[PDB]
């Protein structure tokens, strides 16, 4: 219902005021009603890729449309690059097969080119990546793209803005029920 939906938001407001950080974002994710930009942003910077994909998965799947396909590919690209940078070529190959391979069907050559970064001494030998700066510069610069990709995604375009309402509305409405457990 539309009733149920707007109750979610009230509850959300409450949790945030009770400093229940985790519970807030599990709700956002499971309800799919509000995508917390500033939360997403923070998680990207931290390199929490398992959580990042998990939170996204509450709002869209990898193959839903063209926007979210690139959003995912982009994350699983950076994940693979950092793996490469810390020279953990084991985790890279794992990433390559489990995470990046689903995008090969669409782009067979691109996948081969991503696979060949494994043999380079430093993947910045590849000219298209010679500008990749470090972990921190690269995540933020990727984050910028992601904000755009999300805000242009139709599945998100109605969910990014938290409807503004009075401080502690849920406590006040509960108070109206007490004026009117049990």
């Amino acid at each position: 219902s539309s009733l149920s939906r707007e109750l979610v938001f009230l509850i959300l407001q409450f949790l945030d005021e009770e400093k229940f950080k985790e519970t807030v974002h599990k709700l956002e994710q499971e309800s799919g009603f509000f995508f917390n930009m500033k939360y997403f942003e923070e998680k990207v910077h931290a390199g929490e890729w398992d959580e990042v994909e998990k939170y996204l998965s509450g709002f869209t799947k990898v193959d839903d449309n063209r926007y979210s396909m690139k959003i995912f590919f982009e994350i699983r690209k950076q994940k693979y690059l950092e793996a490469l940078d810390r020279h953990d070529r084991a985790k890279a190959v794992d990433i390559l097969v489990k995470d990046l391979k689903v995008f090969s069907t669409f782009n067979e050559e691109l996948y081969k080119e991503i696979t060949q970064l494994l043999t380079l001494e430093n993947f910045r030998e590849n000219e298209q990546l010679s500008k990749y700066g470090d972990t921190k510069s690269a995540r933020s610069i990727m984050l910028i793209e992601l904000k755009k990709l999300i805000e242009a995604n139709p599945l998100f375009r109605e969910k990014l803005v938290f409807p503004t309402l009075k401080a502690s509305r849920l406590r006040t409405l509960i108070n109206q029920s007490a004026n009117w457990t049990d």
Binding site: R66, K77, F103, L110, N126, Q128, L129, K148, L149, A152
Partner: peptide
């Protein structure tokens, strides 16, 4: 001003 094909850069 946006461009959503898949590549390295």
């Amino acid at each position: 001003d946006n461009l959503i094909y898949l590549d390295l850069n």
